[PDB]
């Protein structure tokens, strides 16, 4: 009654038979912007089912020596489908999200993934190691796209913040012994009712294996991690010609 679940939105349906309940980010469901909070005067467009659907963006292979990966939102969808088209044609952006991470193994595999959502996850550079060099992460690292990016130092999350305290953010654990999926529902987290879907990344999703994957030789060595996500209550405003980046 809590291990089996089915999430349907738009024209896509995601099922699961070994779920571990659903986390609502900060105990708040996604909702449309209230008229007392909106600041733009133009009437926003609400395409509804054409954008509020589960997008399966990429598949990452979990290995015994993996460090972890992170994705930026809504960067991952800035170039995907009708949602990406609307985000390119419209200046303003507002939506929630429903992130479903899939990672399935057998009863003889072991390992634990920490799936967390960190708002305004600003990536820092290693500052040339010693710290005397004022470097900045490249565009391909600050906005990795749909491929995500592999963490270099997951202990500090490449941002000087320990991962041991990452659980203060909305998070779920994919421990292969019990559950093979993590569901996090994240409302719009920003200091503004609307923001640019290209320049600003509202939050970053982190998938870091805390307990290394292990299995005896002979079992299936390819354990993929697949990210599936669906915007919720998406709004757009400030239409103009399309902008690619």
């Amino acid at each position: 009654s809590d291990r089996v679940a089915q999430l349907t939105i738009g024209n896509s349906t995601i099922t699961t038979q070994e779920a571990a309940n659903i986390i609502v980010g900060y105990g708040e469901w996604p909702s449309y912007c209230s008229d007392s909070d909106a600041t733009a005067v133009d009437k926003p467009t609400r395409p509804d089912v054409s954008v509020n659907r589960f997008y399966t963006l990429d598949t990452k292979l979990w290995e015994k020596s993996s460090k972890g990966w992170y994705w930026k939102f809504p960067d991952v969808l800035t170039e995907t489908g009708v949602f990406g088209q609307n985000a390119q044609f419209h200046y303003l952006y507002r939506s929630g999200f429903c992130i479903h991470v899939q990672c399935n193994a057998s009863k003889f595999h072991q390992g634990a993934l920490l799936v967390a959502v960190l708002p305004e996850y600003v990536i820092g550079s290693v500052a040339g190691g010693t710290g005397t060099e004022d470097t900045h992460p490249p565009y391909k690292q600050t906005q990795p796209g749909a491929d995500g990016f592999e963490l270099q130092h997951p202990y500090v999350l490449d941002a000087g913040i320990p991962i041991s305290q990452l659980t203060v953010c909305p998070h779920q654990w994919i421990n292969l012994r019990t559950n093979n999926c993590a569901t996090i529902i994240v409302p719009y987290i920003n200091a503004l009712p609307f923001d640019s879907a290209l320049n600003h990344c509202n939050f970053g999703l982190l998938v870091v294996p805390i307990s290394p994957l292990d299995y005896d030789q002979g079992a299936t060595p390819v354990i993929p991690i697949t990210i599936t996500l669906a915007p919720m209550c998406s709004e757009f405003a400030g239409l103009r010609q399309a902008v690619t980046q």
């Binding site: 309940n21 659903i22 986390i23 900060y26």
Partner: peptide, 15 residues
């Protein structure tokens, strides 16, 4: 405890 379906303290979290 920001879960959708809140579960009782004394019961089993996963059912």
């Amino acid at each position: 405890n920001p879960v959708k379906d809140i579960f009782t303290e004394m019961a089993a979290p996963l059912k």
